[PDB]
């Protein structure tokens, strides 16, 4: 997994690759790692995939109830505080490593969280097995006062470094841009640089190739009238 976050002029952008693995095997080639905590607070997760999804949903659910209770739009520091206290309590057993980003009435924010519950602040961050490849790119090209276009470019380039150089990362680049005073724009499959080439042969079989012992209709309908 390669995930990054990059601050810019009027907001923040996060990005991620789309490969999920079980050991050396690729389970899903187009996985969605950019999760929504709230409309304008998004996070990307590395580590145990179920934990990153579950902890995001739980805090997202409680954030929504909090927003309704307080009649205010949710803040990134609230999501951060709730995530870290949940993860700390479970002493690293919930293997969620997240980059949390968003905009709220206070402004634009970017944080990272470790599974044991420690958090960090930064203008550019990277997490996952491809984080070193991504950080190399970020450390080479990041500057202060980036534009929206420059940040998206930098973020996706950092994910690409992970895609090509880290075996734990691959396939496509997903992006989400969160700008102040605007709707968050989720760009699913922003880049697609790994389409499989056409195969040399068609492996469609002639009908009747497989040997069959018995056939029967399966009753999926309920008990019938009359």
């Amino acid at each position: 997994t390669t995930i990054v976050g990059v601050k810019f002029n009027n907001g923040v952008v996060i990005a991620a690759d789309t490969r999920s693995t079980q050991g050396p095997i690729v389970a899903d080639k187009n996985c969605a790692k950019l999760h929504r905590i709230s409309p304008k607070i998004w996070c990307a997760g590395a580590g145990t995939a179920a934990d990153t999804e579950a902890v995001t949903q739980l805090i997202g659910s409680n954030i929504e109830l909090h927003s309704l209770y307080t009649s205010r739009e949710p803040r990134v520091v609230s999501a951060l505080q709730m995530l870290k206290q949940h993860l700390f309590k479970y002493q690293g057993h919930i293997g969620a490593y997240l980059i949390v980003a968003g905009v709220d009435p206070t402004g634009s924010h970017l944080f990272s969280i470790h599974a044991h519950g420690s958090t960090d602040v930064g203008y550019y961050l990277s997490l996952g097995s491809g984080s070193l490849a991504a950080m190399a790119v970020l450390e080479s090209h990041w500057k202060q006062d980036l534009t929206k276009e420059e940040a998206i470019k930098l973020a996706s380039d950092a994910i690409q470094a992970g895609i090509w150089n880290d075996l734990g990362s691959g396939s496509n680049v997903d992006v989400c841009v969160m700008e102040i005073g605007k709707d968050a724009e989720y760009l699913r499959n922003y880049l697609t640089p790994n389409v499989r080439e056409e195969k040399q042969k068609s492996y469609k079989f002639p009908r009747g190739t497989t040997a069959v012992l018995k056939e029967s209709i399966v009753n999926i309908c309920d008990i019938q009238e009359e």
């Binding site: 206290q85 470790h114 519950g117 958090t119 960090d120 070193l132």
Partner: protein, 196 residues
């Protein structure tokens, strides 16, 4: 990590490097290890980042609730709350915290709370992995009732050496000055302190 707090004539100054590592990888090179638990009571954190953040947040909560009921807490009181958390949960914590604060009655004070959760009031304190390399330097160069400028130089020179020898320390040198005049943040970059 290299952290220290030093009392001087007008109050106290906290100092820290900005490097956090996961093994040999620098996970953050611009960390802020100088943490506010009250207006003029700050702390330097070392050990588990998760633990020391969790502790500091709980202390900040306790001192906020204390203030609402009983007014401004003393630095000793803040150190006591830190100690209670560190001592009672010693089996499940890896935290080395230095507490520094300014009262008008007591002026600048420094308390160090090592791994076991004991408390030690000192004129100055050093902690973190990099502190080992500057026990000699700091003992030879510390004086009581130094000026602000002298104390800044002492901390700058001390943490410079700690950074020079300790791989787990590095980045920028952050400092927080606590006096009657208020709270001042200072930052010193590698090109400045490496040539000392």
């Amino acid at each position: 990590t290299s952290i220290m707090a030093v009392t001087f004539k007008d109050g106290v100054i906290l100092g820290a490097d900005s490097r956090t590592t996961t093994g040999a990888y620098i996970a953050n090179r611009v960390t802020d290890k100088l943490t506010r638990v009250h207006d003029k009571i700050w702390c330097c954190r070392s050990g588990s980042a998760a633990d020391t953040q969790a502790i500091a947040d709980i202390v900040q909560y306790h001192l906020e609730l204390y203030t609402s009921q009983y007014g401004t807490p003393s630095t000793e009181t803040a150190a006591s709350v830190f100690k209670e958390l560190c001592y009672e949960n010693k089996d499940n914590l890896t935290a080395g915290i230095i507490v520094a604060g300014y009262d008008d009655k007591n002026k600048g004070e420094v308390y160090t709370i090592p791994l076991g959760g004991s408390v030690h009031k000192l004129p100055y304190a050093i902690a973190g992995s990099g502190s080992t390399f500057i026990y000699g330097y700091c003992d030879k160069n510390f004086r009581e009732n130094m000026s602000k400028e002298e104390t800044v130089d002492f901390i700058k020179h001390s943490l410079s050496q700690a950074i020079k020898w300790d791989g787990s320390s590095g980045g920028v040198i952050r400092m927080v000055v606590l006096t009657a005049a208020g709270v001042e943040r200072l930052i010193f970059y590698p090109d400045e302190y490496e040539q000392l």
